[PDB]
Write a protein that binds this ligand. Structure first.
Ligand code: 3PE
Ligand code: 3PE
Ligand code: 3PE
Ligand code: 3PE
Ligand code: 3PE
Ligand code: PLC
Ligand code: PLC
Ligand code: PLC
Lengths: 132, 53, 61, 65, 80, 69, 74, 90, 77, 64
């Protein structure tokens, strides 16, 4: 069922500060009546030293599955898509280009693409239409 | 208002404006779907080119 | 009240700023570009300021 | 036309934000709707003038940096 | 009734008509009337029916011409 | 219906369904003011807008490029 | 009436444009009719003014004298 | 009126003269701001050329764009401390 | 005046603890590891990167001198 | 619901039937001038997409 968030210490010794079991106030029963109904807290109830990580204003904690199991599924999902992508690449099953890619006249539109002379023709031209 | 125990809900009788408007809006879509099909079904499936006529 | 003490004040600043802006715009056409605040004084020029700098650097040396 | 299209929605936000108390709920909603509609009509006029007539509009308020 | 690729436009004619760079090819000459009629027709689907079709068929010939280039190249590589 | 404490809570945006008794009078005062600003924006927009594609002839651009060489 | 250093440099550039090309009749005409308030608005803007030749001369001539102050080189 | 820069070089003055040193620092700074003004004018030509040319901006504004990219690395404010405190010849 | 805030003893003890955490800090092995990472390891990583590429990044108006697209297409057949 | 809620939906409904057909040539027409969006000549695949496609792929999303 529920479990505490990460980085919540099991023990602490802050002098004479009371030592209480760390409780996530987000998991408390909402149908009960509290002095502070919004935060699910009664007046003068002691606070954990890291209560800011275990209250309503803390990030919402998800406890449907364990993080290791949740990360196993997350890697498995993208692992399937990775194998599916690599097989088609290594196998080379993706279709070939039906025709020669588009060609353009005037030395592959070199002058219209910022070229200055014949030295910089290949630096700016597109695929040159060799068949005039 | 009074609640009648054990009475099945009959066919609702909505205001006539809602029923007529809904059918006309659907009628506009279906007519437009068929109208484009009558004139673009070759080009849609690649069976013919737009200039060919 | 829609013309209360708090609603009127922001509009007053806009009207005053635009009116003075146009006044300054008209004040520069007839005064060779000089602004409305020319009565307060004039910007000091390099020639007089450098004289203070020359005397200042003389005492320091 | 360009200034009317852009800053008219800002007028509706200001009117409802600071004068919404003095005009009530109903008039606040419709004045905001009015301001957006002015931007709607002005945009459609520009769409014909820009896309179909190959015209561009530029307004320079002032220098920023 | 376009049957062959039309004559290539000159450099200045492409410049004056401001043809898009990606569309500066054999079909540039047929593109000028189409873009001129589209402006007067507000780019409606019922104003440039034939001018659009003539330009559409020209690019079809250009595509088929590039099929020949690939097939011809595909033989030189195997022969070599 | 409910209690909203409106005697002192007076936000600029109303505070729980607020409409003054003289809402009609203020609405007209706002509509006229709102109309007086759209017209002012329109006049400013027309007089300040320009076409960036027509401020220089193409012949002028040719001279700029040749000199920049 | 504050002239920032960038505003001063724009006026100086146009002043040096006159002082170097006093034989160009076209240049003087645009500069004379280029008002002081429009001096710093060279380029595309809402104001209808002739400054194409003003820009053209600047594009062709380096009117800065930074090399003159640096009389020592590597 | 429009006061002009008092052209003075660090190589023709004695730094013990605080007035001459002050002019050399000012003269170098004012020449650097003229370069920035020139850069902004040249960029204005590039902006105007790009808009009117449309798809022809690569060809119509080729020389202007080349000039802007060459001047950009050095048409900026560099200060006077670098040249005042360093002798390039050595 | 009227003590508008209902002071809570648990909140005060929680607040006092947060403001006085330095009293109970111990320079143990756990603390030393965190001190080393934030004050030595992390600055060293930035320290190396800052001087490795110091004066070696002339990005002002950097020019392209290599074609981007491929001229000839080689079919897989 | 009331007419005020309905009114925008009907206007959007009509625009959801005829809008794309009327505006297709403005944005998807071949050679249409849209210099604001730059497409390099080597990246224009509107021809190989329109003609070279097998006829099955034209209807495959519809069938699925
Ligand atoms: C970089 C890593 C993040 C480092 C940032 C510092 C740590 C987070 C500090 C933010 C303050 C946290 C906070 O204010 O409370 C958590 C807040 C609660 O919102 P939430 O739990 O989502 O409630 C949803 C209810 N339906 O939840 C939030 O509002 C936090 C929103 C996300 C913060 C964005 C941080 C970058 C996210 C991209 C990194 C991950 C990329 C994958
Ligand atoms: C709180 C209020 C505090 C107000 C203090 C600030 C006052 C601002 C100073 C106003 C100076 C006067 C002025 O506006 O300048 C005149 C100018 C027209 O002259 P011109 O130089 O030719 O401008 C052309 C620019 N290309 O006019 C303009 O250029 C103004 C153009 C503004 C651009 C459109 C307006 C943007 C903001 C929209 C909301 C404002 C309009 C509604 C006014 C009532 C609500 C504030
Ligand atoms: C809540 C607290 C209160 C704060 C809320 C109010 C904040 C208002 C902030 C205004 C700041 C002052 C800006 C206006 C000062 C005037 C600027 C100026 O000096 O003029 C520059 C411009 C042309 O420059 P020039 O030729 O040198 O004219 C000088 C003549 N003496 O001359 C002009 O064209 C004048 C233009 C005046 C424009 C009026 C202001 C319009 C609204 C701001 C426009 C900013 C752009 C829109 C921002 C909205 C977000 C997109
Ligand atoms: C509406 C404005 C008038 C449209 C032009 C009249 C016309 O001749 O075309 C009717 C047009 C549908 O015509 P369509 O079948 O697509 O092809 C042209 C066949 N005449 O009609 C339409 O385009 C339908 C208009 C939207 C509904
Ligand atoms: C620069 C000098 C660096 C000196 C590092 C001293 C670090 C330190 O304070 O050691 C901790 C210890 C206090 O004991 P504690 O905090 O409990 O840690 C024990 C963990 N088992 O502290 C001690 O054991 C007491 C010894 C402190 C010696 C301080 C001498 C300073 C002289 C040079 C000043 C400069
Ligand atoms: C669009 C955003 C609209 C904002 C809505 C809220 C209204 C703002 C407001 O409240 O600003 C209030 C201010 C001044 O307030 P005050 O003098 O204390 O009067 C309010 C108190 N009364 C009613 C009791 C008398 O007025 C203005 O307009 C000021 C415009 C700015 C002028 C610039 C001053 C120079 C500063 C230095 C510059 C370098
Ligand atoms: C370009 C920026 C332009 C911004 C101008 C827009 C108009 C401003 C309207 C202000 C009045 C208002 O809405 O804030 C006040 C309203 C009042 O609440 P109410 O709805 O009247 O009901 C009242 C019922 N209470 C009392 C339970 C709330 O809400 C609030 O207390 C919300 C608190 C945060 C307000 C954030 C203000 C906007 C921040 C903008 C950041 C740049
Ligand atoms: C048709 C014309 C369209 C334009 C309309 C313009 C309206 C201008 C506003 C007039 C009303 C007014 O200034 O309201 C002032 C308001 C209202 O509260 P108050 O006045 O203090 O009253 C309460 C106090 N009491 C109880 C003592 C009387 O104060 C505020 O808290 C304003 C805080 C600033 C909010 C906006 C910040 C924006 C920052 C970014 C800016 C771009």
């Amino acid at each position: 069922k529920s479990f505490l968030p990460h980085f919540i210490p099991k023990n602490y010794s802050y002098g004479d500060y009371p030592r209480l079991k760390p409780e996530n106030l987000q998991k408390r029963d909402p149908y009960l009546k509290y002095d502070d109904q919004a935060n699910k807290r009664n007046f003068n109830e002691p606070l954990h030293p890291q209560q800011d990580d275990l209250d309503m204003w803390a990030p919402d904690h998800f406890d449907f599955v364990q993080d290791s199991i949740a990360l196993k599924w997350f890697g498995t999902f993208f692992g399937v898509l990775a194998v599916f992508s690599s097989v088609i690449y290594i196998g080379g099953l993706y279709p070939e280009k039906p025709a020669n890619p588009r060609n353009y006249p005037f030395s592959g539109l070199a002058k219209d693409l910022g070229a200055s002379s014949e030295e910089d023709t290949l630096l700016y031209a597109a695929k040159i239409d060799k068949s005039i | 208002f009074k609640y009648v125990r054990g009475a099945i809900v009959p066919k609702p009788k909505v205001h006539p404006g809602y029923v007529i408007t809904s059918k006309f809006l659907g009628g506009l879509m279906w007519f437009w779907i068929f109208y484009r099909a009558k004139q673009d079904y070759p080009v849609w499936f690649g069976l013919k080119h737009p200039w060919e006529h | 009240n829609i013309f209360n003490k708090w609603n009127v004040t922001p509009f007053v600043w806009l009207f005053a700023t635009v009116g003075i802006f146009q006044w300054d715009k008209s004040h520069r056409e007839s005064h060779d570009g000089k602004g409305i605040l020319d009565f307060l004084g004039e910007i000091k020029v390099k020639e007089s300021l450098d004289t203070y700098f020359k005397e200042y650097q003389t005492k320091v040396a | 036309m360009i200034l009317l299209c852009i800053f008219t929605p800002f007028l509706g936000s200001l009117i409802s934000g600071f004068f919404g108390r003095y005009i009530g709920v109903n008039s606040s909603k419709w004045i905001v709707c009015l301001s957006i509609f002015v931007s709607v009509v002005s945009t459609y006029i520009l769409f014909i003038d820009v896309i179909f007539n190959e015209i561009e509009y530029t307004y320079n308020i002032m220098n920023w940096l | 009734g376009v049957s062959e690729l039309p004559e290539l436009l000159s450099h200045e004619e492409m410049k004056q008509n401001k043809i898009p760079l990606a569309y500066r090819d054999r079909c540039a000459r047929l593109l000028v009337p189409l873009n001129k009629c589209r402006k007067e027709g507000w780019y409606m689907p019922w104003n440039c029916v034939q001018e659009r079709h003539d330009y559409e068929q020209c690019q079809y010939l250009d595509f088929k011409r590039r099929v020949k280039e690939l097939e011809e190249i595909k033989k030189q590589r195997d022969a070599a | 219906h409910h209690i909203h404490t409106p005697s002192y809570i007076k936000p600029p945006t109303g505070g729980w369904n607020f409409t003054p008794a003289n809402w009609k009078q203020n609405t007209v005062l706002v509509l006229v003011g709102f109309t007086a600003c759209c017209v002012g924006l329109y006049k400013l927009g027309e007089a300040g807008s320009y076409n960036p594609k027509l401020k220089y002839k193409e012949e002028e651009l040719s001279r700029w490029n040749q000199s920049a060489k | 009436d504050d002239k920032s250093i960038d505003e001063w440099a724009m006026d100086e550039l146009l002043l040096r444009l006159k002082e170097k090309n006093l034989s160009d009749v076209e240049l003087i005409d645009e500069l004379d009719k280029l008002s002081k308030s429009h001096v710093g608005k060279i380029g595309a803007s809402e104001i209808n003014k002739r400054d194409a030749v003003i820009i053209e001369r600047i594009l062709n001539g380096e009117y800065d004298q930074l090399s003159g102050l640096k009389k020592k080189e590597l | 009126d429009h006061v002009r820069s008092p052209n003075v070089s660090f190589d023709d003055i004695d730094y013990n003269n605080s007035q001459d040193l002050h002019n050399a620092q000012e003269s170098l700074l004012r020449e650097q701001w003229i370069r920035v003004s020139a850069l902004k004018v040249c960029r204005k030509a590039l902006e105007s050329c790009y808009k009117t040319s449309g798809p022809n901006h690569y060809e119509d504004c080729r020389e202007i764009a080349e000039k802007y990219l060459n001047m950009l690395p050095d048409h900026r404010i560099q200060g006077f401390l670098g040249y005042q405190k360093n002798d390039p010849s050595k | 005046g009227p003590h508008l805030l209902r002071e809570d003893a648990s909140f005060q003890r929680y607040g006092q603890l947060r403001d006085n955490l330095a009293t109970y800090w111990k320079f143990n092995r756990k603390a030393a590891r965190n001190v080393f990472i934030f004050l030595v390891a992390v600055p060293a990583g930035l320290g190396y990167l800052a001087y490795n590429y110091e004066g070696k990044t002339p990005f002002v108006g950097k020019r392209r001198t290599e074609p981007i697209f491929e001229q000839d297409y080689v079919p897989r057949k | 619901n009331d007419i005020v809620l309905i009114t925008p939906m009907i206007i959007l409904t009509i625009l959801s039937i005829f809008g794309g057909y009327l505006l297709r040539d403005i944005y998807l027409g071949m050679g249409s001038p849209f210099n604001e969006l730059f497409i390099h000549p080597n990246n224009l695949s509107l021809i190989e997409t329109e003609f070279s496609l097998p006829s099955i792929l034209k209807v495959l999303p519809l069938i699925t």
